[PDB]
């Protein structure tokens, strides 16, 4: 248990290290944002499953009903990024700084 959570905390961070350095796609950053969630599902389930805290076992699903509803709103904006450009490159949306 204290060998995975350093290894899962270090898996959260790499995904946090990934969704701050982009590579010309908005849809690979949204994509890196779900593996970020996923390490929190597991690092929450185990804590609620070695401690036998079944009362907290409703939580690893409530975290995850907002992992897809956030992805849903995330995916649906690409529809409105594509329909302006059709390319989905993050470098293409810079006309707000004006």
């Amino acid at each position: 248990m204290p060998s995975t959570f350093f290894n899962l905390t270090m898996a959260f961070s790499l995904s946090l290290l990934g969704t701050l350095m982009f590579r010309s796609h908005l849809m690979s950053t949204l994509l890196c944002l779900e593996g970020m969630v996923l390490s929190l599902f597991i690092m929450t389930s185990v804590t609620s499953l070695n401690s036998n805290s079944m009362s907290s076992m409703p939580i690893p699903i409530t975290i995850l009903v907002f992992a897809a509803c956030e992805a849903a709103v995330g995916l649906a904006l690409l529809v409105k990024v594509s329909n302006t450009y059709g390319t989905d490159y993050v470098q293409n949306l810079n006309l707000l700084q004006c």
């Binding site: 995975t4 990934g18 590579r23 796609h25 890196c32 609620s48 499953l49 009362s55 076992m57 009903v65």
Partner: protein, 171 residues
Amino acid sequence: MNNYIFVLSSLFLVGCLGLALKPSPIYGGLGLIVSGFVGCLMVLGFGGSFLGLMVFLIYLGGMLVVFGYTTAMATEEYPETWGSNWLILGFLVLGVIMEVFLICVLNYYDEVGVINLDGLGDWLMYEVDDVGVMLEGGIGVAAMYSCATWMMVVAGWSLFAGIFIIIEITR
């Protein structure tokens, strides 16, 4: 056997490492269906068979859409993913050497106990239930209907509103 979960855990860190390098969304999505499967192993390596399968049901029908839109929004004339350059393949091989480095660094500093490669595999369950019944997970997740019925309305309302919140973004 003793080295079971450290393997499933390091194969997860890797499934989330290449996921972070941001290849094309396909080989990132592949990088998550794996790490989602691997998450079903360690969640199950510590007991509950329900919670692991859930991730391995959501993020299959999750990444089935991620395959759909990327073919329509997020895809180049050439994907250029892993075996396509050397900027990713260096920091995919030097990330793993950094791993074997780092975990082997701080077993020498065996004072904080972040990893104990000699005392490994002997601390995973912590005195569960041995004589017992009606204990698994899914009894806890079913507290949505007894004693935790606010996790239930608050998440149901999110999906009631997501269905409206989503179409006004398309319209």
